[PDB]
Amino acid sequence: DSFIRQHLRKLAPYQPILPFEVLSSRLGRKPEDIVKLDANENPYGPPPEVMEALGSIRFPYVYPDPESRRLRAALAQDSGLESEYILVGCGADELIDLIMRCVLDPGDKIVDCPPTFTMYEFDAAVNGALVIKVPRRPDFSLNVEQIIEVVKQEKPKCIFLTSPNNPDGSIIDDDDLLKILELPILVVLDEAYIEFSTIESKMSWVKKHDNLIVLRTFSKRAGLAGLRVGYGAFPLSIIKYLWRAKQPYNVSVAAEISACAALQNPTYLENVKDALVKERGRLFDLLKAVPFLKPFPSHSNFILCEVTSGVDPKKLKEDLAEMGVMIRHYSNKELKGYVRVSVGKPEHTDVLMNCISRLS
Amino acid sequence: DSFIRQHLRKLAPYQPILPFEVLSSRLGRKPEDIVKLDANENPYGPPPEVMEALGSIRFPYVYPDPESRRLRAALAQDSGLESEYILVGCGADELIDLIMRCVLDPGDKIVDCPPTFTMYEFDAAVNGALVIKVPRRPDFSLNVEQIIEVVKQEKPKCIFLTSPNNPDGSIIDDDDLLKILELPILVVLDEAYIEFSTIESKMSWVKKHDNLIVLRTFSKRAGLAGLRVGYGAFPLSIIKYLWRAKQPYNVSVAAEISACAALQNPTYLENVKDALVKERGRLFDLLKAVPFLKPFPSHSNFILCEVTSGVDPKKLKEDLAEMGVMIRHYSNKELKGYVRVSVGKPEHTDVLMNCISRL
Ligand code: NA
Ligand code: NA
């Protein structure tokens, strides 16, 4: 019948997607003219040292350093955590997948707290794990009482927690995180958006908690989503096995060089973060004035809006796309009544608001 | 105790590797002045279009195309196979792993034919599969009779086969491949080195054999090992599930752009391949004259040598490294007596032979 595992054959058929360069040409626009606010990308791009370095790669024909030593030394300086705790991956996506495949046997359970990042449930499915959903409360805070109860009853092995959360941008309180860390479970804290907040990274907590992992990325604030480079802080008892099991070469020389180059320009990284945090405030006020949008407070580089007044989030998203403006809408049941608008340049917000006005 | 799956806690401890730049300083040389013949890399590098493109990436801050549409159209044109058969990976390494993840449950069996590429047994271990070893014969050819008997006895799910093989460079004769394809098993044919041979790629066979996958890479002939981009031809009944199960974004925009750019210059790709093939013959004759090396015939961009009695292969490799030439030495018991010498520029061969004469 088939060589493919039956569990994977039960996944929904792949729905092809047209690149935004294809939407661009279908609208008769240049790709750079699309206002792309649907993936939390940083439209300022990375510091100028990155493109200078990418254009002068001296050894493209040599395998990259599988230990990412240069970058891990730079991340140890950046984070204050010793490099022996730090692993680099081809995006934080690779590290989420690596953790699941190294921790979860077939049928093991993870806890998820929706609405949250869709890759946790996708990676659970492809890795043969079951998901226990413990929905967030109406203000998007964790229901810690329910997490404790399901963890005691069903004995899941892992819980993935995003802070600031995707898609609403709220943060997890220290006491809530510590309560969950008391449970016999591996806690993966995803700090993909932490730089847009004034909250300190918890990378250093892995020295005191051997059931905590903290994940970070260059994809968002550092403007390197296309290059695929992220990293995490891991307890020594975990990372010793991840070194043994990980693929050697998924992090390309272009990823290594770009991340190192980005860290050479802290002024640029601070300034672009400050520009996006400032625009987040302006965008919030502008969305709040739209009669059919109810934005939520956010510590990230995006704003979630409840769509009200009988307006359909899918039609709104499709109408904006026809005008050359991309925002995020949701197919799943937990998020079908919302849209998520990423923070871009002020000019991007202006185009978005002008298009919303024309649709209102 | 540990959160790590039990089968992974039995993997051998990780052995750290000195990075190439650090090794070069330790040898007292600029990295560009090291003669690096230990990893089958192409020292001519990729076509000039690649660094032109890498220096002008428009959208580094945007996620890459998870469907690799531009590259797959270019690969369809290059290969003669329709794009619906073609998947792109973060190196051929990603596709090797992806196939095992999608086909093998823990405890399923896979056939391997050592000595061969170490990643098949590594990926099998990480995925919890059981390896059935059917060793190659002394001339490194497959033992087809034994593969057939073992497959009928043990009912493994898949077999990976390298052609040209790494480390000796022999090719699987097409009649042996067909005999294995006649078995109820998934055959993954790894053509990482096929461009260095005069044998046509079997990608086209995938249309007629729904138990055949053919893997290819940009890391070797095309000089893009650092950028991490490979691809494969897959039966339609398989690739439809791989699309559903694969990670979306492991192939970076730099990988997509560099592979497309390399394919813009078939003149360069053919010329550097021809230069390496020519140098392979010259290198083979020179190594053969060395009284303590027994080179094997090869269709790849490397030559395996058996080191004759009384010479320590590890000391040989370390002595050459001290003189600025890197060759491949093996720790595993199967290959401990052999060294593998990659083909480089003619001047690299000259440096290597000068160093050998000084030993
Ligand atoms: Na409103
Ligand atoms: Na000889």
TrEMBL record, chain A:
Domain of life: Eukaryota
SUPFAM superfamilies: PLP-dependent transferases (SSF53383)
UniProt keywords, alphabetically: Amino-acid biosynthesis, Aminotransferase, Histidine biosynthesis, Pyridoxal phosphate, Transferase
InterPro entries: Aminotransferase_I/II_large (IPR004839), HisP_aminotrans (IPR005861), PyrdxlP-dep_Trfase (IPR015424), PyrdxlP-dep_Trfase_major (IPR015421), PyrdxlP-dep_Trfase_small (IPR015422)
Gene3D superfamilies: Aspartate Aminotransferase, domain 1, Type I PLP-dependent aspartate aminotransferase-like (Major domain)
Entry annotated with the keyword Amino-acid biosynthesis: yes
Alphabetized GO MF terms: histidinol-phosphate transaminase activity; pyridoxal phosphate binding
Aminotransferase class I/classII large domain residues: 33-353
GO biological process terms on file: L-histidine biosynthetic process
Catalytic activity: L-histidinol phosphate + 2-oxoglutarate = 3-(imidazol-4-yl)-2-oxopropyl phosphate + L-glutamate
Pathway in which this enzyme or protein is active: Amino-acid biosynthesis; L-histidine biosynthesis; L-histidine from 5-phospho-alpha-D-ribose 1-diphosphate: step 7/9
Cofactor needs: pyridoxal 5'-phosphate
EC number: 2.6.1.9
The protein's name in its UniProt record: histidinol-phosphate transaminase
Organism: Medicago truncatula (Barrel medic)
